[PDB]
Amino acid sequence: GPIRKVLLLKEDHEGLGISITGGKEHGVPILISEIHPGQPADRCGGLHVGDAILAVNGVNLRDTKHKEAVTILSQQRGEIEFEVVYV
């Protein structure tokens, strides 16, 4: 699939509005498993269930354990770039 770079905007009190699965120990990419209605990922309109998150704000998440990916994702603020591909 083609890589897309997608901007998500959120305020600090918000989460990203996604659930993710996967990570290095699981032998699979970080994948979006749910998009939460009204939350930032839904609002931006460019992130979908089944998208792999390859990177966020230039942090490579292709070879990172689940929890470390969660932590990096959870530290992002403001306008946040997702590098994704539908697999």
Partner: peptide, 10 residues
């Protein structure tokens, strides 16, 4: 095996 997905809301 424990029946649980690895899934986190973030």
């Amino acid at each position: 095996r424990l029946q649980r997905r690895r899934e986190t809301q973030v």
